[PDB]
Design a protein around this ligand. Structure first.
Ligand SMILES: NC(=O)c1ccc[n+]([C@@H]2O[C@H](COP(=O)([O-])OP(=O)(O)OC[C@H]3O[C@@H](n4cnc5c(N)ncnc54)[C@H](OP(=O)(O)O)[C@@H]3O)[C@@H](O)[C@H]2O)c1
Ligand SMILES: NC(=O)c1ccc[n+]([C@@H]2O[C@H](COP(=O)([O-])OP(=O)(O)OC[C@H]3O[C@@H](n4cnc5c(N)ncnc54)[C@H](OP(=O)(O)O)[C@@H]3O)[C@@H](O)[C@H]2O)c1
Ligand SMILES: NC(=O)c1ccc[n+]([C@@H]2O[C@H](COP(=O)([O-])OP(=O)(O)OC[C@H]3O[C@@H](n4cnc5c(N)ncnc54)[C@H](OP(=O)(O)O)[C@@H]3O)[C@@H](O)[C@H]2O)c1
Ligand SMILES: NC(=O)c1ccc[n+]([C@@H]2O[C@H](COP(=O)([O-])OP(=O)(O)OC[C@H]3O[C@@H](n4cnc5c(N)ncnc54)[C@H](OP(=O)(O)O)[C@@H]3O)[C@@H](O)[C@H]2O)c1
Ligand SMILES: N#Cc1c(-c2ccc3c(c2)OCO3)[nH]c2nc(N)[nH]c(=O)c12
Ligand SMILES: N#Cc1c(-c2ccc3c(c2)OCO3)[nH]c2nc(N)[nH]c(=O)c12
Ligand SMILES: N#Cc1c(-c2ccc3c(c2)OCO3)[nH]c2nc(N)[nH]c(=O)c12
Ligand SMILES: N#Cc1c(-c2ccc3c(c2)OCO3)[nH]c2nc(N)[nH]c(=O)c12
Lengths: 249, 249, 248, 249
């Protein structure tokens, strides 16, 4: 029997590439999405086309609420329903927008940023662990957590909490054989709304090659961490940033 | 005229000492509390018996919710109402209990621990910044954030986000002359629930002195960080642990 | 054309496993050693038996001195001599003994611990860069921030290795050279250590209550020098089973 | 009886401020220097004109060689001979220049930067500890240890090693009551040879004020760390950088 993997926010960009590669490795995937219903579905269609019944979709909002614990348990549940097992969880879904200190209200901002980046990953880990070889969770972190974007404080707090969850969960879930690790991109696929002038300014800052990471480059770190080549690695966070975090002001 | 400072969860223990020492320095203090009402009024009495009209009390629940932004704004507004100014905010109040991955429900456990330790300090920082000449914020952190206690995931996640806030708030509030900094205790006042055998067990781990810190010793770093001796210090976290975090397993 | 790798202190233990792994991946290796002459050669025979003209030995002391720059240039040189090219450098050789503040003279201890753990790696990096998927892998320590008692000099050299890994990555990026690290917690324990002492250490490890096998440390090195890491540089990968996360 | 302190490379700039400040505090100081003879002697005169028998000088080259251990032993000795005690050690002397990986030969470059920044501090610490109440060492570090200058390999290797000495020594010397701590400037006094265009360029990168630190601001961190307000503090490194380390590329 093949193994299975939940990948959150897998309809587009880095998440898509993670799923495509995990699928290519022989994993049966659960494709989580929120708004991108069309891309999510046509991907699962594409993945099923060359291996029958190996992909399923699952929609949830991961924003913080009194219903998030239930939302998160269903996503883990979907994997056991579809495939009868859950071997890998990839926490990838993420809200990313400015929240300056000086349309959405602040309580919405808090819920969306802390919810997607930290709280949901925590509950998804709880469910993952409680529903239980090569079992392992992978969190998509940030290489620049200590040299952050201006006015992106709430986002930063969430990414900082993701590091704390990764280390905490790694410690607790080790006696059960569950490895928790992280993958921290510097600058990868730039936001779809980013203009070519502001995209290239960030490129010129990258020591290794003067470009952003492909999604496939980030996905390769995930594959390594879930492979049998990482049987002794837990609580680790792998930067994939082309040395960008080493560059001073 | 005397400067004014608000210290959260300051009825008892480490917060008490921080307010006491800030008062002795010459500050007018706001003593925020949650449950410990009787100790909060008793402290305000002693501080006003020393100097008339220099201390006020302010009850608030810092548990995460949609009304918290208003709660945190209120606390900042009590200070501006009592003393006509707010110079220093000390984020001290914190929930601390285990939340295992394998009475209170998880959505309560999330709201309390991420609320008190991270989100509340973020909202207080907004209101402080908003209401605005040696201006500084001091967040009470944790030295052991990278070697956390077992089954203490939500708390650790919170404390980690406080590092992210201290870092991001410092950078953004820098052109307004507001310094954001942190103080990280190893083991200080041990919890009231802990037995004498378990407290001793932790004391023997400490390299410097084989004992915990007094709250006076934690407060001392706070006074430093808000003094005119730290004018160029911002985004810094002063570990006050007696080398505890250096000890390997 | 088969690619070529230099691996320091590769006669036995972790270094031997990194050489064996790189050979099986299809690399031509340079087995460096200090005192273990018989083991380095006996390894080279076993690798040349599988593939003719693929392994060589190279002796050098990496203890700091005014001749060390030359010693290191020669190790690089022996690679270009035997194989015509130099693709990978694994900084693995390391002195490890207590040097308390309160047999060897202090200036020997300094020489051996700072030379092998930091200064030699720095020099091999210059020579590797000067002589030119090119990548350097520096073997570090997961416990650099939670050090062993009375082991100051060792920790100083391991801390300086992190510093080199970062600074080299930054400068050698425009040349397409990737500098990275693998940081073991507790792996193959000293020869040399008692059995009751080794069990006390094993019981500390969250994942398995065992130390890392040499081959498990080798796996992370194989990753960093592969095409799967094309974008990774200035990174240090903990391979420690959660050791660095355990409080006292 | 007044306490005594050793301060390396104390003739001009930062180390001069530490010395002057330690003097105003009440310490008897040993002004170490290497090449600034007139500057070191001139300072001793000004400090002695204030309080008689409080300031002496000690010339030494701290570049690494076989005769370095005895040199460092002699500096520690100077203090004990002039004052009959040694309470505080400030490791300040530092070589700072490029060492590209692609006049001075390489082995001379290794000797100076590693020697001044790390090996000397280790030997001075040994001798300080061997010779032995508020006993403390303070190492001058770098806030930018993780975002280094281009082609400053050896120097940055040195300041990294300095952080490891601060931690290993703090752990080992704790049973004795010797606290080892650090002070990490971002940009204080800029190099004398640096151009005013390049000086302003580094200044405008600083979040808090858009200017470098006064040497006296750095000194304030040293003073705090050797004081009774820092009794429980050991193994700590205080950044004093105006938030420079937090600014991304
Ligand atoms: N891109 C970079 O340069 C970069 C840099 C550093 C770190 N990273 C990290 O790597 C990961 C992937 O990066 P990315 O650029 O691919 O990110 P992204 O496109 O902005 O976000 C990934 C997905 O998360 C989902 N999502 C957003 N908000 C959600 C919500 N409130 N509830 C549930 N799902 C939500 C979205 O799916 P739907 O459209 O279907 O809603 C989206 O496709 C992220 O964790 C990110 O933080 C990326
Ligand atoms: N003590 C240590 O060994 C240690 C170690 C590391 C870090 N720290 C940090 O140092 C700071 C102070 O330590 P501590 O031991 O004095 O803390 P603590 O006594 O355990 O808690 C501090 C205060 O927080 C208030 N509080 C609790 N829940 C709250 C809520 N839901 N909403 C608003 N306020 C709430 C309480 O006030 P009421 O009683 O009035 O409800 C309490 O007095 C904390 O940030 C702590 O995490 C302490
Ligand atoms: N083993 C662990 O638990 C552990 C933990 C953390 C990090 N590491 C790191 O991983 C790497 C390998 O560990 P290991 O246990 O395999 O190492 P090791 O046995 O302690 O040393 C490896 C080799 O280094 C060479 N060497 C020693 N002193 C030298 C000198 N003065 N000049 C030149 N070469 C010298 C020796 O070669 P010869 O025998 O030929 O003389 C030795 O075989 C090391 O860099 C270490 O720092 C290991
Ligand atoms: N300036 C900055 O922006 C900055 C930034 C970060 C950290 N720091 C750290 O802060 C400390 C002081 O800074 P600084 O700018 O005042 O340093 P500095 O002016 O560059 O040099 C400090 C002193 O060290 C002595 N010295 C140089 N080479 C020596 C050698 N080979 N042997 C013995 N002594 C030697 C010199 O004394 P003589 O002139 O008498 O020969 C010099 O005055 C240093 O440890 C530095 O690493 C400075
Ligand atoms: N650009 C960018 C992003 C970053 C990012 C990239 C480069 C940075 C950064 C954040 O901090 C400073 O350097 N993080 C993101 N997370 C999500 N979910 N989506 C994104 O687009 C990004
Ligand atoms: N003991 C303890 C506490 C700790 C603590 C003590 C020792 C530790 C620790 C947290 O992480 C591992 O080592 N954090 C606390 N926070 C609050 N609010 N109250 C507490 O009592 C503690
Ligand atoms: N054991 C061990 C070693 C360690 C080591 C092992 C366990 C540790 C450690 C270092 O820090 C605290 O936990 N570092 C070494 N370096 C070399 N060169 N050779 C070794 O054997 C070790
Ligand atoms: N400028 C500068 C210096 C720095 C320095 C300044 C700015 C930096 C830095 C080091 O890291 C990147 O940003 N370190 C120094 N050490 C000595 N001994 N003397 C100096 O002048 C400096």
């Amino acid at each position: 029997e093949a193994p299975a993997a939940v990948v959150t926010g897998a309809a587009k960009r880095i998440g898509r590439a993670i799923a495509v590669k995990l699928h290519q490795t022989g994993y049966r995937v659960v494709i989580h999405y929120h708004n991108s219903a069309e891309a999510a579905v046509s991907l699962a269609d594409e993945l099923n086309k060359e291996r029958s019944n190996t992909a399923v979709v699952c929609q949830a909002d991961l924003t913080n609420s009194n219903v998030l614990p239930a939302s998160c348990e269903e996503i883990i549940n979907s994997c056991f329903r579809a495939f009868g097992r859950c071997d890998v969880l990839v926490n990838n879904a993420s809200a990313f927008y400015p929240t300056p200190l000086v349309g959405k209200t602040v309580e919405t901002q808090v819920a969306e940023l802390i919810g997607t980046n930290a709280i949901a990953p925590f509950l998804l880990t709880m469910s993952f662990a409680q529903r239980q070889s090569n079992l392992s969770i992978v969190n998509l972190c940030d290489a620049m957590v200590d040299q952050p974007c201006m006015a992106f404080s709430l986002y930063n707090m969430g990414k900082h909490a993701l590091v704390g969850l990764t280390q905490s969960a790694a410690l607790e879930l080790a006696p059960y054989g569950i490895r928790v690790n992280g993958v921290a991109p510097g600058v990868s696929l730039l936001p779809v709304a980013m203009g070519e002038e502001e995209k290239d300014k960030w490129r010129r800052k990258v020591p290794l090659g003067r470009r952003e990471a492909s999604a496939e480059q980030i996905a390769d770190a995930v594959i390594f961490l879930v492979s049998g080549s990482a049987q002794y690695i837990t609580g680790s966070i792998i930067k994939v940033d082309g040395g960008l975090s080493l560059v001073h002001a």
